Design a protein around this nucleic acid. Structure first.
Lengths: 205, 124, 233, 325, 264, 283, 283
DNA sequence: ATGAACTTCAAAA
DNA sequence: GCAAGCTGACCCTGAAGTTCATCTG
């Protein structure tokens, strides 16, 4: 079991139902944690998956609206001009949040010849102990940092102790099975969790 | 809320002005305006243009009072208050100007009571 | 969930002087409308009216933007009536309810003559001076509140250094000496708690300034209260 | 739980019988109501306004759900029975000709196909023959109170047959089944699951409905457009895998909540509230009775459920309140 | 192409003006609702870097693409071409629709919403104008005067945390020249992008930690806790940079890490 | 157009009067509530420069816009009646109108305004950008009031004899404010800010308070103007260091300030001799 | 109209009496609470000039408005009954009424007032703008009070015939105040301030305190008037330097001041005769 | 053939 | 003698259908 301390100062886990008005989940998105684990260390022979998530800081909503764009980026139009692409897009940020994730990993289909479990295990361990990562993790969006730290058991308290409140169907992970390498066309199958104990326990497909 | 050992010049200046205002108020009941109703407007700015006249007029007020013991207590209070005045400055700083009014109202509140000045003088 | 409404409305009660057209419970839309410039159309719907009631209906800490906009409107209207006084205490009393601010304590609905904070006593003094000016001249054009409230709820020495010389002449202009004596007694009893005039007042103290101002103002608007307090001098 | 809790609350209020939409309907505020007989013949231009200090757009009525116009060639939408004032009499005070006549043509084609798809009703036939007579629509403008519906824009027009005077043309037990089947068989042949708030199948609700009450215009709550609002190239609407049987429910719930007693704005933001009924909150919704009395107590019956304090802008709805406590 | 990991803590300040207002609440600077500390979104930093690049380049392979109208008016092969013919794409990334990974060009640079240290004091200066605009109800025939509204802060010291990798730099083209250009921007881009509402705003610190390996050798949390920027002893409210105490902690990074002080 | 970048620090003193009165607090001077230091907004200086240019120029290619008898919609409609009538495409007609307004109206290149009314035509940023002013020593407030023997409107104050309405007119005992201003290059190339316009702007800056005066503002003049010029669009040194060079502190013994002798000014120019030039105009 | 700019410094002394009173201080002289220096508002000098002009002129095109028995609404209604009745467009009727009030009433071109009552008609800025006065040496306060054997209303007296209400009438032992005033050109062209009006204004300035006197103000006169004249609407030198030329300091040995011999006045007119002229009227 | 500009939808408290 | 007139703000930036013009196809 790999224990990780995913902390941060702000969080904006943009929900799929409200994208023109960004709204963060009350907890950390399992897909966000999986993308964090991939950005720390990933290889087309190891499949990252989250097992358990424990919340360490309470919710703290801050109304922050930005002047975003609604136009994509292509090669035909050589410019953009944000004067005609302005969007008052809100984003309720989560100030002062920290989470710990207990996760593991399995194998993929294109494992190849270098698919040693212990090798990737010790590699992720030394990356977490020495602050090594492939890409900087994002806490909801890449506009926020993730000062991760390797832990073993419990090194931080948790306020969510009793039965708090539910969260509904949250975005677990996209369906990458019906897609070639380099995803481009995939759905967003959301799933439930458990209840409102200490955190959110992800259910594997 | 009063500190005799404030070690501030504005505080003791204000407390002296307050004892002088108390003297003026006790000098005669029938009065439309005390000395503080015209001198405080400039004592906070230029205290040398007020306190000299007030101290020179204090003997007449003490003469036209009603009890010599109260006058002795008030002059002893004046002495122990202005003992900290090392030098009359040319201009008062605005912080010192505010501390002036602070000490003034503190000393007026301390005086306008019942048995406090005599109790403080008992330990002297 | 009604416990949050109860903890919001029990402190929402203020002093409210006599013959005041303001009700006992200020309407929440009209209560937050005191943070706007004039009409309820061009305000700040985010960290203000779109989060103040959020923290209200959940027993949560009020935003600091509430205090900022309240100070801005006190600098604008130059007088805080029944609208921001019943809303500035919502930030401090809730912050002390949960423990997050500095050393100050909670507040009440009446005029507390203790506390010993460096910002509340300044507001009480300013309200006493305002009522002294009001009693000295029944009519004028702009109160000393309408002249000082811009920065008096923050800078003690910068304005009171040129303001404590005005109430002596104001009491002199009074046709009744007993009223002047009672005003002097109350201002002395108030300033007895003020240890000194600091260089400024912190953001957590300007709200206390406005609260004490409104408290002393609506307390001196009573039919018989200052005389009753002066009877025990 | 943005639309999940809203869907659960709608499933509670719908099965309580208290004036709410269902299947494929919506409570719309129709100002002037046109009353006819059995075969066309405009005979009454009734108005049921006069409510608050401002003359609102009439009373509320359960009409078919709006398909969502707002576009260049907006006549290609062609709603069922309720629409604009240019879809009935082809009138246009500020819209102009040509663009308004094609709206009337689309509307009469819609009512004709509804008649041919549902005959023997003594209701759809009247509105079908009223638009193909070319002698009563011009008489509608020469009514008794027609000079009042022209000074105010956005005047919705409905049809009410004779021998009822209480139920519209879209209220008799006949077209209701057609509208219910439209959102059950016609509006279910599209993209598969999985849903976003129910976790079941349900087709992907492309082009979300518009919520009326928050802004001046029917502002849609959650709707992706432009181009950058896509996740994996879903292209407008498919970004949120929301089902029809949930998107319709949440839109109708927001419509019912933006026009009843719970609709009140503190300042540029409508902070509507509700309860779980197991509503009777009498706490947040009780902020506008008469002179603000004292109804706060402690009966150990404080219902849960959060409140949604949404605000308008141009044509989108911004969410700012989120607190279960 | 760079083969090192970079973690830069950027300390900037706003003296007189609006550092980053709120479009949802008029134009007041972003502060915290609980602790009260000010906030500045990293998108403003990105836009200022873009503007500085547009001012200092105006040539091929160093444009911005994501520009404004009032300021400047098979698959992987086209993606690589678009990355090469722009600087923002090699710096912050692209969203080329005709891409691979769902049309997403990430990029090495990743900033952070710079949060202020102490709770700032938003001063709302409702000014006025001696000229009306459209024929409104407030434009009487007597005088044409309208009231305004500006926002400022006596002093706001914000601290951003940016990361730069090498794998995305090898894919886009963020070489050492682009890195030096980004440093020259960070150390001097506020001075090139000034206005009336934003007022005065400059940079006061940029501490960069360069790692030996291409992945790192120390966590980012310890690096952020090293550079301690707090308030001095006998200072309650702040007015300039001379009231803040900044202390570096280079007593534990002398192993396989280089430290650069490009700002202070 | 100009190629060099300019950063100027302007130190200006006021002896008596209110420099920038706040419309909120009736007439209280804009003073920092947490440190007691005075603050002067840049809009006042910009309006003074506008008034000076309007008084001195009064010709073509040197516009400022009139006072209260001016309507922005009318000026836009007048500017949209030259060569860019309708046959220029509204996407390019906005840019054409912006260029024409920048070329014909010198105020737009100096301190641009708004161009989005009934007919949109773009927006101008302008390379010349001024910042707010700040005083080093915390100034004091006097709260001086005055009276008036006349009566405005026949309200309730119209007594049988005394028809007085009092009045408030604040003043500052002394205040040396320090403002910062920036002039780039690319915006000057897009708008058309040349060297003659730069010299006219410097003349307006050095002759700002020397003309426009009133009763509430009292006596106001200038003290110094230290300009740093970069020979390119790149900045080899941060502007914070240049701003910290001109150090204006209080007296060694006197706690307050009353004249230029109280404010001790020190200039340390022993590092700005690389690719930057230093110039002095105000003193 | 005039084509030259004028900046005048007026030094006037008071031997006994209160020059300008404080509204919220009963009758305390307006003295700086932080330095003890006396301050005289410009409104007092403007009203004295108004009274002098009203006493000397008393004819058409030389109005001042009456005292106590004058209503601004009545004067506006009287001014709006000439050629600009109603057929002039309100937007232009305001400008026409402003021009007529500037041409017919000399007080408007001297020291303009308000024109927005029941019927708006614009607003006048006026090129003549005076500033507040300031004393170099910090004056002292005497707080001289007096009594009165008569009683106002029968309510504040004693229970017998001993009627007394006391009284307060402050005075200054000596005070040499310095005031600054500016006269532009464009505002004079818009209002109509010509050279004869300028000479009349200079005469009113040099004969200000020589006529209007009372008991509370005591003895007040003038000492000097140094005027700088720019031959154009442009300022080749800042006004601060010209204000610092006329240096009035205290005595070398005497710490206080009591006459003109105590105030040492020095004029350094060496580097200011380029395009400017210097004139002396008061002394 | 699909990214950016054009045109219609209600007439805010 | 509780003020006079003077505002307390510009303009957009939306959802979706219909046109404008330069990318590999």
């Amino acid at each position: 079991r790999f224990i990780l301390e995913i902390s941060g100062d702000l969080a904006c886990f943009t929900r799929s139902e409200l994208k023109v008005e960004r709204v963060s989940y009350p907890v950390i998105t399992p897909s966000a944690a999986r993308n964090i684990l991939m950005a720390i260390l990933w290889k087309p022979a190891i499949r990252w998956k989250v097992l358990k998530i424990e919340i360490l800081k309470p919710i703290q909503w801050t109304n922050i609206r930005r002047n975003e764009v609604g136009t994509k980026m292509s090669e035909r139009s050589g410019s953009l001009y944000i004067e005609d692409n302005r969007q008052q897009r809100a984003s309720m940020l989560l100030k002062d949040v920290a989470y710990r994730i207990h996760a593991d990993f399995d194998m993929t289909s294109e494992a190849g010849e270098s698919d040693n479990y212990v090798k990737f295990a010790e590699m992720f361990k030394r990356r977490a102990k020495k602050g090594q990562y492939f890409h900087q993790p994002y806490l909801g969006c890449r506009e926020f940092p993730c000062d991760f730290r390797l832990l073993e058991k419990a090194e931080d308290g948790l306020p969510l102790e009793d039965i708090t409140q539910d969260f509904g169907f949250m975005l677990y992970d996209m369906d990458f099975s019906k897609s070639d390498p380099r995803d481009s066309n995939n759905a967003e199958p959301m799933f439930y969790q458990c209840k409102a104990v200490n955190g959110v326990i992800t259910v594997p497909p | 809320g009063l500190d005799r050992n404030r070690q501030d010049i504005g505080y003791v200046l204000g407390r002296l002005f307050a004892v002088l205002e108390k003297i003026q108020a006790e000098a005669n009941p029938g009065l439309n305006a005390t000395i503080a109703d015209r001198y405080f407007g400039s004592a906070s700015s230029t205290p040398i243009a007020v306190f000299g006249t007030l101290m020179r007029l204090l003997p007449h007020h003490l003469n036209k009072l009603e009890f010599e013991g109260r006058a002795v207590q008030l002059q002893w209070e004046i002495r122990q208050i202005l003992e900290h005045c090392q030098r009359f400055p040319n201009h008062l700083n605005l912080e010192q100007q505010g501390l002036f009014a602070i000490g003034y109202y503190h000393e007026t509140q301390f005086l306008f009571t019942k048995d406090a000045l005599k109790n403080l003088f008992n330990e002297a | 969930l009604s416990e949050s409404i109860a903890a919001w409305y029990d402190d929402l009660q203020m002093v409210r002087g006599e013959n005041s057209p303001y009700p006992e419970y200020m309407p929440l839309p009209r209560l937050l409308g005191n943070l706007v410039l004039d009409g309820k159309m061009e305000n700040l719907p985010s960290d203000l009216i779109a989060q103040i009631t959020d923290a209200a209906l959940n027993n949560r800490v009020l935003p600091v933007s509430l205090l900022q906009a309240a100070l801005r409107r006190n600098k604008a209207e130059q007088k805080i009536t029944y609208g921001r006084a019943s809303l500035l205490k919502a930030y401090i009393n809730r912050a002390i309810r949960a423990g997050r601010l500095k050393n100050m304590k909670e507040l009440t609905m009446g005029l507390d003559r203790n506390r010993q904070d460096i910002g509340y006593v300044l507001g009480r003094l300013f309200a006493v001076l305002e009522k002294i000016q009001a009693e000295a001249n029944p009519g004028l054009n702009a109160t000393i509140a309408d002249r000082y409230f811009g920065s008096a709820s923050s800078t003690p020495i910068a304005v009171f250094g040129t303001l404590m010389r005005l109430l002596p002449h104001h009491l002199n202009k009074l046709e009744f000496e007993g009223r002047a004596v009672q005003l002097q007694w109350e201002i002395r009893q108030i300033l007895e708690h003020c240890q000194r005039f600091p260089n400024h007042l912190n953001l957590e103290q300007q709200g206390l300034f406005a609260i004490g101002y409104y408290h002393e103002t609506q307390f001196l608007f009573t039919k018989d209260a200052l005389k009753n307090l002066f009877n025990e001098a | 739980m943005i639309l999940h809790a809203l869907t659960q609350y709608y499933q509670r209020k719908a099965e309580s019988d208290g004036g709410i939409a269902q299947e494929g309907f919506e409570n719309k505020e129709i100002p002037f109501i046109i009353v006819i007989d059995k075969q066309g013949n405009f005979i009454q231009l009734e108005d049921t306004r006069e409510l608050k200090v401002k003359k609102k757009v009439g009373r509320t009525f359960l009409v078919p759900k709006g398909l969502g116009r707002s576009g260049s060639k907006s006549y290609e939408v062609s709603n069922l029975l309720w629409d604009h004032y240019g879809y009935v009499l082809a009138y246009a005070g500020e819209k102009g000709q040509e663009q308004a006549d094609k709206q009337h043509a689309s509307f009469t084609a819609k009512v004709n196909e509804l008649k041919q798809a549902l005959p023997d009703d003594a209701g759809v036939t009247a509105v079908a023959a009223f638009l193909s007579s070319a002698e009563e629509k011009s008489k509608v403008m020469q009514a008794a109170n027609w000079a009042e519906c022209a000074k105010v824009k956005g005047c919705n027009l409905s049809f009410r047959l004779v021998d009822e005077a209480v139920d519209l043309v879209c209220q008799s037990k006949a077209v209701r089944e057609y509208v219910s089947q439209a959102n059950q068989t016609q509006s279910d042949n599209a993209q598969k699951g999985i849903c976003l708030v129910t976790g079941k199948a349900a087709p992907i609700a492309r082009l979300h409905n518009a919520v009326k009450g928050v802004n001046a215009k029917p502002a849609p709550f959650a709707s992706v457009n432009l181009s950058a609002f896509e996740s994996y190239g879903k292209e407008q609407g498919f970004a949120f895998p929301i089902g029809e049987q949930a998107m319709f429910e949440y839109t109708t719930a927001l419509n019912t909540l933006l026009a009843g007693e719970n609709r009140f704005r503190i300042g540029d933001v409508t902070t509507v509230c509700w309860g779980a009924k197991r509503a009777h909150i009498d706490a947040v919704k009780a902020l506008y009775k008469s002179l603000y009395n004292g109804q706060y107590c402690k009966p150990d019956g404080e219902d849960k459920f959060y409140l949604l304090g949404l605000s308008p802008n141009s044509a989108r709805i911004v969410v700012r309140f989120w607190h279960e406590t | 192409t760079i083969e090192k990991r970079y973690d830069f803590v950027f300390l900037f300040d706003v003296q007189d003006g609006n550092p980053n207002g709120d479009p949802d609440a008029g134009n007041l600077p972003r502060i915290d609702p609980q602790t009260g500390e000010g906030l500045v979104t990293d998108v403003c930093l990105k836009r200022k870097v873009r503007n500085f690049i547009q001012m200092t380049q105006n040539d091929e392979h160093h444009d911005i693409f994501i520009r404004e109208k009032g300021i400047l008016n098979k698959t992987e092969a086209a993606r690589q071409y678009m990355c090469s013919r722009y600087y923002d794409i090699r710096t912050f990334g692209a969203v080329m629709t005709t891409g691979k990974n769902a049309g997403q060009v990430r990029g090495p640079v990743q900033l952070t919403f710079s949060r202020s240290i102490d709770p700032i004091m938003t001063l709302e200066h409702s000014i006025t104008r001696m000229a009306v605009t459209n024929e409104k109800d407030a434009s009487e025939t007597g005088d044409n005067r309208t009231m305004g509204r500006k926002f400022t802060v006596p002093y706001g010291l914000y601290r951003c945390h940016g990361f730069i990798s090498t794998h995305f730099a090898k894919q886009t083209g963020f070489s050492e020249n682009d890195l030096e250009l980004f440093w020259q921007a960070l150390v001097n881009m506020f001075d090139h992008d000034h206005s009336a509402a934003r007022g005065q705003m400059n940079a006061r610190g940029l501490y960069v930690f360069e790692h030996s390996n291409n992945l790192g050798d120390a966590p980012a949390d310890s690096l952020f806790k090293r550079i301690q920027v707090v308030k001095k002893d006998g200072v309650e409210v702040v007015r300039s940079f001379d009231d803040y105490l900044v202390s570096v902690d280079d007593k534990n990074l002398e192993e396989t890490k280089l430290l650069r002080k490009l700002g202070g």
